[PDB]
């Protein structure tokens, strides 16, 4: 139910994103009612653990910068080759 995210500060380059995905992290974005858009990054292993523990339509307690906002996985991007999640869309369900 709980996942910790790190705010992505500034505009990442292509190399920054490549290093992020190599280091086992997933870029993500949080938006929706009660929250302002913010780019974050979560650990892939931890995210998979949370998602298997709550399912697909579940509610995730996402620590986003001194705020424990509740989100749902609106969408995600997957690379079928190398079997790696590449991006997540966390929708703050209010």
């Amino acid at each position: 139910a709980s996942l910790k995210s790190i705010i992505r500060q500034g505009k990442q380059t292509r190399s920054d994103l490549k290093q992020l995905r190599k280091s086992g992290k997933v870029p993500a974005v949080v938006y929706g009612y009660g929250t302002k858009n913010v780019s974050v990054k979560v650990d892939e292993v931890e995210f998979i653990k949370v998602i298997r523990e709550v399912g697909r339509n579940g509610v995730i307690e996402l620590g986003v910068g001194s705020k424990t906002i509740k989100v749902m996985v609106a969408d995600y991007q997957f690379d079928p080759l190398k079997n790696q999640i590449t991006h997540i869309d966390f929708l703050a369900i209010n």
Binding site: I48, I51, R52, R56, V73, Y76, F78, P80, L81
Partner: protein, 137 residues
């Protein structure tokens, strides 16, 4: 399958083979699929041979989906002719396959049976392949 019933133009520019697979990258009709990891033309004869192998091993019972169709005709000049004097005549029909494209899907058999059937089919194809399951979180 085999070939289109008709096409507007029977002499077509050959398709571009660089890049990654544009679509059809997920299992959507069955439980398991054969995913290409390498790029090539795939002919109708190759498709038919792979299909016969997979369905014969599965002993019917299951369902087979062929996700690629040979839309593109390709031409070949007659044996031993000089260059020029127009384009040749249609020789066969091909599909372009790029990494990620699901080639076949199966359902209605166990996981082990699906794996064996897809391996047998893959040995008929000009591409490297990987066994894939229906994608969930």
């Amino acid at each position: 399958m085999l070939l289109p019933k008709r096409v507007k133009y029977r002499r077509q520019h050959r398709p571009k083979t660089t890049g990654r697979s544009k679509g059809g990258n997920y299992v959507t009709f069955g439980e398991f699929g054969l995913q290409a990891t390498t790029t090539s033309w795939i002919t109708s004869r190759q498709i038919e041979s792979a299909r016969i192998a997979m369905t014969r091993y599965m002993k019917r019972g299951g369902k087979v989906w062929i996700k690629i169709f040979p839309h593109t005709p390709y031409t070949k000049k007659p044996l031993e002719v000089r260059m020029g004097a127009g384009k040749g005549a249609v020789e066969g029909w091909i599909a372009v396959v790029k990494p990620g494209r699901i080639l076949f899907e199966v359902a209605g058999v166990s996981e082990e049976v699906a794996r064996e059937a897809l391996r047998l089919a893959s040995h008929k194809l000009p591409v490297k392949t990987k066994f894939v399951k229906r994608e969930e979180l």
